[PDB]
């Protein structure tokens, strides 16, 4: 087992840190995070300014869902429903 | 898998238990420091015949 360990370690680090595919995956996930953040920024920018009432309600709908109390209530309801369906 | 993942967690735990004991190098190099500290203590012998 120790010999197989050494054989695997001889390649898990060498020739792997060179191309840095782990760094590539980290860059991909960082890019996804930055994209979602900037898209949220753009949505905020377009929302900050028939249709006027709809735009006004858009701000309140976007703000309400982000509240932690709403998230706690939703997760509690989901857990209760899952227990109910698992009450069998 | 998941117990193995728990074992993998244990792996990380072992990586925390023993793999984090690398501390700070505090020398000139990383491998050449080992070479220097290894080749400076070496002493000649005689091998009488």
């Amino acid at each position: 087992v120790l010999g197989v360990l050494s054989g695997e370690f001889s390649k898990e680090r060498e020739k792997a840190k060179a191309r840095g595919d782990f760094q590539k995956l980290r860059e991909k996930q960082q890019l996804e995070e930055d994209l979602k953040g900037y898209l949220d920024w753009i949505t905020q920018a377009e929302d900050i300014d028939w249709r006027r009432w709809n735009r006004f309600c858009r701000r309140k709908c976007r703000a309400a869902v982000k509240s932690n109390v709403f998230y706690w209530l939703v997760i509690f309801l989901v857990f209760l429903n899952t227990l109910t369906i698992a009450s069998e | 898998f998941f117990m193995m993942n728990i074992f993998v967690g244990f792996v990380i735990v072992t990586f925390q238990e023993q793999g984090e004991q690398e501390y700070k190098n505090c020398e000139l190099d990383k491998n050449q420091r080992q070479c220097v500290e290894y080749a400076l203590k070496a002493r000649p012998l005689r091998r009488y015949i």
């Binding site: 197989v4 360990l5 695997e8 898990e12 | 193995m4 993942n5 074992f7 993998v8 792996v11 990586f15």
Partner: peptide, 22 residues
Amino acid sequence: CGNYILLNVFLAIAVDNLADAE
């Protein structure tokens, strides 16, 4: 030659563990 491969599969699991260590 079977069991070693399974152990190599376990090594692959170790590689999976490597995939779980990366």
